Amino acid sequence: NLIKQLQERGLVAQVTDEEALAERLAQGPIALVCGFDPTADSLHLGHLVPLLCLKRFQQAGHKPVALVGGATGLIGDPSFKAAERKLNTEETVQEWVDKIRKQVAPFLDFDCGENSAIAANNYDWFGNMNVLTFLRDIGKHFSVNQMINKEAVKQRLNREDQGISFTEFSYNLLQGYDFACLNKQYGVVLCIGGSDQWGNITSGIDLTRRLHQNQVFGLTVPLITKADGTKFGKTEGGAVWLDPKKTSPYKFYQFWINTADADVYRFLKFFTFMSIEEINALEEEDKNSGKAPRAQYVLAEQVTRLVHGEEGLQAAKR
Amino acid sequence: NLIKQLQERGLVAQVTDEEALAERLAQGPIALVCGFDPTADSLHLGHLVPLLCLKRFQQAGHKPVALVGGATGLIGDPSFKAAERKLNTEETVQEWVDKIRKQVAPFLDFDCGENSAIAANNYDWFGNMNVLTFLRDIGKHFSVNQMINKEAVKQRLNREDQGISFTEFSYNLLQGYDFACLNKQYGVVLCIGGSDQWGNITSGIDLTRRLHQNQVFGLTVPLITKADGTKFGKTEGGAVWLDPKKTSPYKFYQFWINTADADVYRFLKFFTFMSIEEINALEEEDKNSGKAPRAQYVLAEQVTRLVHGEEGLQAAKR
Ligand SMILES: Nc1ncnc2c1ncn2[C@@H]1O[C@H](COS(=O)(=O)NC(=O)[C@@H](N)Cc2ccc(O)cc2)[C@@H](O)[C@H]1O
Ligand SMILES: Nc1ncnc2c1ncn2[C@@H]1O[C@H](COS(=O)(=O)NC(=O)[C@@H](N)Cc2ccc(O)cc2)[C@@H](O)[C@H]1O
């Protein structure tokens, strides 16, 4: 049902147990979660993929849990990161943390009773957790041997040149715990994220099992890349922040207009709520049209509106 | 001077910088430490060797710091251990800790003046420490790459049959910090322990340099064993405790008088305070004297009074 729908949009990289998950979603609504760490004072175009995905689940009747890593942001996810990351002050992360919560809010119905959205922060629990407690209760459930051969950190370990701190090496446990913790108190049985996050989610489904014996689920969406395999979110001036202050609505819309013909269609699937059908209709319509492609105009309008409301769209054009 | 004196009786296995440590010990009295983890309600003969080196250094005028791992004993030191030590309740361990402390107190002088002994417990700084505080303020200084190859745990990894949890894999950072922490509040510049405790010491040396920029040293005593090969401190009823209740003064004295001829002399150098001279005369004497060796008798008289006092001795005689 739903999974298959997302597959049609090409928004599904890997699924831990497609069937069981598919069957579970069927039984009735569930609660899922997606996490975002405070690396900046705003999220960017990349983050909008998973985020928009929660909303997609919500509309299918599920309850989204949007979690900001108030704690993991003090450590740093080393997942597929080639080089160690630098630690940001406790005060700066806080500030950033707050800008994100608020920034994420507008993207989800936080009131419709049943499946109203939930904002969550792991600082809530890791923030005042004794180190010994953490090592004992969670640590005893992780094997360094296998922690070592996880794709998300494998390479940094095997390299007489590269390396990784004990700190970021532990990152895995905290996100892993977050799952079990969000499951214990909210019934969250699904965690979604971009491909890179897989390993982190994996550890999460495992801890949740050995701590509460609950079959939990994981589902990742591919990391969206420009067709010409360049970057994304990044341009000549930097990341396409969602924060109007960092990227004007006018500039934001101009961005989508400039999409390549080999992307615009996929991008309409990843960023808009257009019936996979009409998107194909639009493609076909554009192909046989001796006219210019209108897909970009669509894409630009839809996203600029999702991210900035009619106000921002009105601005985008003046 | 002192370093070489301890070598005379083979109580030194390694030293971080013999030359410099030698020069430093000469400059004047220093603060040194040795730690003992609560893994039972009592210590055994193996623990005595190191403990005795602390009293040695003290007689030489230095300040002994006797630490008890109220926190480490909750994590489990994996050093050269074959299988994962299991966790003990917080309840049990604190109970063992008191025991070990009080048991330890008699062996060191707690009021000779400037070099009076200090009782220490790392639960003091780990019991109330945030995990995020730990992982970043300390973790950030440990390379998983270098951690994986450290001898004390190269075993557990690089093996199919074995394994190590994230918990015990973290032990190194705790003892490493204990050194730094001790160096900052007592100016402790020396950490002595058994051969197996080396790597743990090293890591302390570095963190101390890395966190305070001070040259700190480490020296390990050889792991005393029976020349015949078999494990030390073991019997039919197992380990020989220092707790009269676990091992009566009588049984204790008997264990000593039963010492093998190839061990008895070394044992006099390790477990007693006889000068290397008289211990050598004794060996010589025993050599060409139609009588039975009296070193056994001596050794038992000494160690028995050391560990149980005049009462304990007179008791091993009835
Ligand atoms: N270009 C992109 N396309 C698709 N997805 C993308 C993307 N760029 C980022 N993302 C995804 O959207 C999120 C972006 O935030 S993130 O900083 O990368 N998140 C992280 O690093 C996670 N460790 C955060 C986290 C997740 C769960 C927790 O319980 C705690 C923390 C991630 O799930 C990432 O996989
Ligand atoms: N048979 C033996 N011969 C000589 N020395 C021996 C011995 N058996 C044990 N020892 C030494 O005497 C001590 C015995 O206690 S122990 O439980 O093994 N100690 C430990 O495991 C350390 N991790 C304790 C510790 C040390 C320093 C800290 O800052 C914190 C904790 C260690 O220094 C050990 O190396």
- Residues B145 and A153: beta-carbon distance below 8 Å: no
Give the ligand 2 atom nearest the CA of B72. Answer: 31
Give, rounded to a whole angstrom, the gap between the first and last alpha carbons of chain B: 42
Distance in Å, CA A197 to ligand 1 centroid: 7
Give, rounded to a whole angstrom, the gap between the first and last alpha carbons of chain A: 42
Q: CA dihedral defined by A245, A95, A184, A143, rounded to 10 degrees?
A: 100
SS3 of residue A59 by DSSP: helix
Contact at CB, B145 and A157, closer than 8 angstroms: yes
The runs of H, that is alpha helices, within A225-275 are: 249-257, 264-271
SS3 of residue A40 by DSSP: coil
Question: A274: buried, middle or exposed (CB in 10 Å: 19+, 13-18, 0-12)?
Answer: middle
**Residues 6 or more apart from A218 whose CB is under 8 A from it?**
A14, A15, A16, A190, A191, A192, A198, A201, A202, A204, A205
> Domains, chain A, ranges and CATH?
1-223 (3.40.50.620), 224-318 (1.10.240.10)
Catalytic residue among B24, B55, B81, B150: B81
Q: Which residue has the tokens 């030359």?
A: B19
Contacts of B87 in chain A (CB under 8 A): 136, 140
- Residues A17 and A205: beta-carbon distance below 8 Å: no
Breaks (C-N over 2.5 A) in chain A follow: none
Among A257, A249, A264, A234, which Cα is nearest to A305's? Answer: A249
Question: B165: buried, middle or exposed (CB in 10 Å: 19+, 13-18, 0-12)?
Answer: buried
Backbone angles phi, psi at A219, to 5 degrees: -150, 120
Give the ligand 1 atom nearest the CA of A222. Answer: 4
- Residues A166 and B193: beta-carbon distance below 8 Å: no
Q: Residue A42 carries which DSSP code?
A: S
Among A52, A99, A51, which Cα is nearest to A73's? Answer: A99
**Residues 6 or more apart from B212 whose CB is under 8 A from it?**
B180, B183, B184
- Ligand 1: residue of A33, A36, A226 to mutate (most ligand atoms within 8 A of CB) is A36
**How close A147 comes to chain B (CA, Å)?**
9
- The structure tokens listed for B23 are 């020069």
Ligand 1 binding site (Cβ under 6 Å of any ligand atom):
A 35-37, 39, 46-47, 49-50, 67, 69, 72, 77, 122, 175, 178, 193-194, 196-197, 200, 221, 223-224, 232
- What span, in angstroms and rounded, lies between the C-alpha atoms of B170 and B147? 10
Among A117, A134, A37, which Cα is nearest to A78's? Answer: A37
- What span, in angstroms and rounded, lies between the C-alpha atoms of B23 and B20? 5
Q: Where are the beta strands (DSSP E) in chain A?
A: 14-15, 31-36, 63-68, 118-121, 188-194, 217-221
- What span, in angstroms and rounded, lies between the C-alpha atoms of B266 and B227? 9
Contact at CB, B148 and A147, closer than 8 angstroms: no
**How close A42 comes to chain B (CA, Å)?**
23
- A140: contact with B, CB 8 A cutoff: yes
The Cβ-side half-sphere exposure at A111, using a 13 Å CA radius, reads 1
Interface of A with B in 84-113 (CB under 8 A): 87
Nearest residue of B to residue A135, measured between CA atoms: B167
Among A167, A155, A152, which Cα is nearest to A203's? Answer: A152
Helix (H) or strand (E) holding A41: none
- What span, in angstroms and rounded, lies between the C-alpha atoms of A318 and B24? 76
- What span, in angstroms and rounded, lies between the C-alpha atoms of A223 and A269? 14
**How close A93 comes to chain B (CA, Å)?**
13
- What span, in angstroms and rounded, lies between the C-alpha atoms of B19 and A273? 73
- Residues A165 and B144: beta-carbon distance below 8 Å: yes
For ligand 2, atom 35: residue with the closest CA: B194
Question: Is B85 in the active site?
Answer: yes
Question: A279: buried, middle or exposed (CB in 10 Å: 19+, 13-18, 0-12)?
Answer: buried
The Cβ-side half-sphere exposure at A304, using a 13 Å CA radius, reads 25
Question: Is B235 in the active site?
Answer: yes
Q: Residue A87 carries which DSSP code?
A: P
- A161: contact with B, CB 8 A cutoff: no
Nearest residue of A to residue B153, measured between CA atoms: A144
- Residues A192 and A34: beta-carbon distance below 8 Å: yes
User: In terms of DSSP bridges, do strands B118-121 and B63-68 run parallel, antiparallel, or are they unpaired?
Assistant: parallel
**How close A208 comes to chain B (CA, Å)?**
17
Alpha carbon of A175 to those of A88, A172, A192: distances in Å?
Answer: 18, 6, 12
Distance in Å, CA A232 to ligand 1 centroid: 14
- The structure tokens listed for A114 are 């049943």
Distance in Å, CA B171 to ligand 2 centroid: 13
Contact at CB, B87 and A136, closer than 8 angstroms: yes
Per residue, the 3-state secondary structure of chain B, as one string, reads: CHHHHHHHCCCCCEECCHHHHHHHHHHCCCEEEEEECCCCCCCEHHHHHHHHHHHHHHHCCCEEEEEECCCHHHCCCCCCCCCCCCCCCHHHHHHHHHHHHHHHHHHCCCCCCCCCCEEEECHHHHCCCEHHHHHHHCHHHCEHHHHHHCHHHHCCCCCCCCCCECCHHHHHHHHHHHHHHHHHHHCEEEEEEEHHHHHHHHHHHHHHHHHHCCCCEEEEECCCCCCCCCCCCCCCCCCCECCCCCCCHHHHHHHHHCCCHHHHHHHHHHHCCCCHHHHHHHHHHHHCCCCCCCHHHHHHHHHHHHHHHHHHHHHCCC
Among A56, A25, A42, A62, which Cα is nearest to A233's? Answer: A42
Contacts of B141 in chain A (CB under 8 A): 165-166
Contact at CB, B165 and A143, closer than 8 angstroms: yes
Question: Ligand 2 pocket, B176 CB below 6 A?
Answer: no
